[PDB]
Amino acid sequence: NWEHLLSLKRQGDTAKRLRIEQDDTRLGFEVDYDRIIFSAPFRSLQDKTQVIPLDFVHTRLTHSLEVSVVGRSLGRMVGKKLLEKYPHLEQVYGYKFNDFGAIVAAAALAHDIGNPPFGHSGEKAIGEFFKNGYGKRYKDSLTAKEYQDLIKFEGNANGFKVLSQSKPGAQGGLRLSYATLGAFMKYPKESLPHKPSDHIADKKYGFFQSERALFEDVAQELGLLKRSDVSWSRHPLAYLVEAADDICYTIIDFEDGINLGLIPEEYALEYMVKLVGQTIDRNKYNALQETSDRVSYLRALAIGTLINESVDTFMKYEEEILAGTFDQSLIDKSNYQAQITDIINLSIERIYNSREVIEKEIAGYEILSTLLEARCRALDNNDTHYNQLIQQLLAPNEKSLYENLIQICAEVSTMTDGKALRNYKKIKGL
């Protein structure tokens, strides 16, 4: 039922928080966007890696801004078509098509807020620290599920924890709406069992053990269908966010590789022909001189056509998605797949395998390793003077072993690229 997925209540509330008893000046979903914009974890995203660590190449903030726009455009179309399909939503409860767009934009904006620095290599380094490092010492003292988290550290779970972190005086963290939290969650399941099927929603997990109760409350309120260990079904707005995010990195990474000197414009024109086919003006395209304008022009046309195709695909499978039987994404069920696959393969071949990227990944790999081992050694025995010095420097701000480790991981994931590099250099006296 759509009347239950669009929940407006927040943590610690006791009233009903009806839609028809609210001012349209500042909607509850818009307050979530305002809170995320002014947050400190969001502001720290300006110094984090998209593809090339450490210019005119995108970072983690612009990426989010772009996704926040595309997903808003997708969700607004989707909400308009649902209201067209379902008339009782706009007659009894009082919903409008802007609500879906606001929800998807709010979910899209903070969808990459808990990722560790140095991009893809940071999570692998954190996971390998507890497997082939000193962290293996803690294997015997933890249960199977907790050890699974630690050895398979995820950005989605860290983002959810950042969004819903309780502190003395601030209960619930940012205190976002339950609809936004439901749309933000992509893998509504625990860390075990590991990949029990080929479904799209069970490849990874979405929350730690310390946040099981909060997500259980969110799921119970939203009405997500139980599947099994606890596991639920995906929110359709999560599908929209995923599709928007997918279109963005695929196109933006392609064009970024094209301008930086690693891919020729011949591939740009050849691989993007059917996407920009019945939307282009050849006179305007030929009138341009610089390659950047042409690439932007193509990028602009591909994004529009992919947005329209994704909306059509979502409206095709509405009953299956709402029933929880849909086992794939929206991009993979689109007509244009060979070109997308070719673009992804070319980016993997020539962008992700460049020498500078590998060097920076190795450096981040080493830096995170030493930082984690230093934090663990400081935590272990808080007796020596050096350990006290490390505690005063790294973490100057009573809990069990599993919470202590997860807080260390979260603190490491909070630092930016430049801050981590400076800390690594000045802990070594360099």
Angle, helices 401-414 vs 355-380, to 10°: value is 140
Figure out which of the listed residues 9, 69, 230, 312 binds a second copy, where binding follows CB under 8 A. 69
User: Residue 189 pairs with which residues in a beta bridge?
Assistant: 231
- Give CA 393 to chain center in angstroms: 30
Q: Is the four-CA dihedral 164, 170, 176, 177 of positive or negative sign?
A: positive
Buried b (16+ CB within 10 A) or exposed e, 149-162: bbbbbbbbbbbbbb
Q: State the residue for tokens 């909060």.
A: 214
Window 231-290: residues binding a second copy (CB under 8 A):
284-290
51 binds ligand DTP (CB under 6 A): yes
**47 labelled as ligand-binding?**
no
213 binds a second copy (CB under 8 A): no
Give the whole-angstrom CA distance, residue 51 versus residue 49: 6
157 binds ligand DTP (CB under 6 A): no
Q: In the stretch 62-101, what mask flags binding to Mg ion with x, by CB under 5 A?
A: ----------------------------------------
Q: In the stretch 361-380, what mask flags binding to a second copy with x, by CB under 8 A?
A: xxxxxxx-------------
Kindly report the CA angle at 10 between 7 and 16, in degrees rounded to 5?
Answer: 60
Element (H, E) at 149: helix 144-151
> Shortest distance, CB of residue 379 to ligand DTP, whole angstroms?
28
**245 labelled as ligand-binding?**
yes
> Shortest distance, CB of residue 403 to ligand DTP, whole angstroms?
24
Tokens of 217: 């409350």
DSSP 200-228: TTSSS----GGGHHHHHHHHHHHTPPP--
Pinpoint the alpha helices (H) of 317-416: 318-323, 338-350, 355-380, 385-394, 401-414
> Shortest distance, CB of residue 428 to a second copy, whole angstroms?
7
8 A C-beta contact, residue 237 and residue 177? no
Q: Which is nearer to Mg ion, 99 or 246 (CB)?
A: 246
**34 labelled as ligand-binding?**
yes
Where along the sequence are the contacts to a second copy (CB under 8 A)? 24-26, 33-34, 37-38, 40, 43-44, 46, 55-56, 58-59, 61-62, 65-66, 69, 73, 76-77, 80, 97-98, 167-170, 284-290, 292-293, 296, 300, 353, 355, 358-359, 361-367, 386, 389-390, 392-393, 397, 419, 421, 424-430
Binding-site positions for dATP: 26, 34-35, 50, 73, 186-187, 253, 299, 352
Binding-site positions for Mg(2+): 63, 111-112, 245
Binding-site positions: 26, 34-35, 50-51, 60, 63, 73, 111-112, 156, 186-187, 204, 245, 253, 299, 352, 361
Binding-site positions for Mn(2+): 63, 111-112, 245
